[PDB]
Amino acid sequence: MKIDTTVTEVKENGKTYLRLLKGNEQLKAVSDKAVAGVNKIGSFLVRQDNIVVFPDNKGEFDLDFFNLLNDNFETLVEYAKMADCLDIAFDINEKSYFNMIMWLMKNIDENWSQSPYGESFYSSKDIDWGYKPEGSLRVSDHWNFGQDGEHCPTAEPVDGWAVCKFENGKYHLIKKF
């Protein structure tokens, strides 16, 4: 879907801002909470109050993917708040990230925990860098890391966002996003 990507320097209350005036108008046909942004394939940024659409080099954005964000906006904002992310970013190549968040917000409960260091989540509060209880889950996009694959090793290859279960010293895939 094509939108206007001309950038205008607008003065508002004594400060200057870059805005896509016509693009912002046109996004009203598809959402009441979308803004057209400026920075080659296109991306999106989900903020607390709106979705920013960064069009591709044709001035076009993927409306089908946009509709997933727009229709499930409250879940995305709740995820970002929970995970301590000011905003969250998507590409057409980030459907697995979207699907992870949807699954996580449905399945998480008060006894889950998050890594202190990023967007990795655990089904227990009894987790640290060196101990995982058997049967506990981990939701993450990075596996088999550190030197020689020592950290969060998996029984078989896991590339990208996944849910795995810990048994006998290794993670075992149960859902690939």
Check whether 67 is labelled as a binding-site residue. no
Nearest to Mg ion of 34, 127 (CB atom): 127
CB nearer to Mg ion: pick between 13 and 168: 168
- CA distance linking residue 145 with residue 43, whole number of Å: 28
Instruction: Name the residue number minimizing CB distance to Mg ion.
Output: 168
Lookup: tokens for 133 = 């209880």
Closest C-alpha among 2, 94, 96, 91 to residue 42: 91
According to the annotation, is 25 in a ligand binding site? no
**Min. distance of Cβ 148 from Mg ion in angstroms?**
23
Angle between helices 63-71 and 95-107 (to 10 degrees): 20
Strands 8-12 and 51-54: unpaired
Indicate the residue among 57 and 168 with the shorter CB distance to Mg ion: 168
List of residues contacting Mg ion (CB under 5 A) = 168
Q: Is residue 158 within 8 Å of 171, Cβ to Cβ?
A: yes
Q: Closest separation between CB of residue 115 and Mg ion, Å?
A: 23
Instruction: State the minimum distance, in angstroms, from the CB of residue 172 to Mg ion.
Output: 11
Annotated binding residues for Mg(2+) = 134, 168
Annotated binding residues = 134, 168
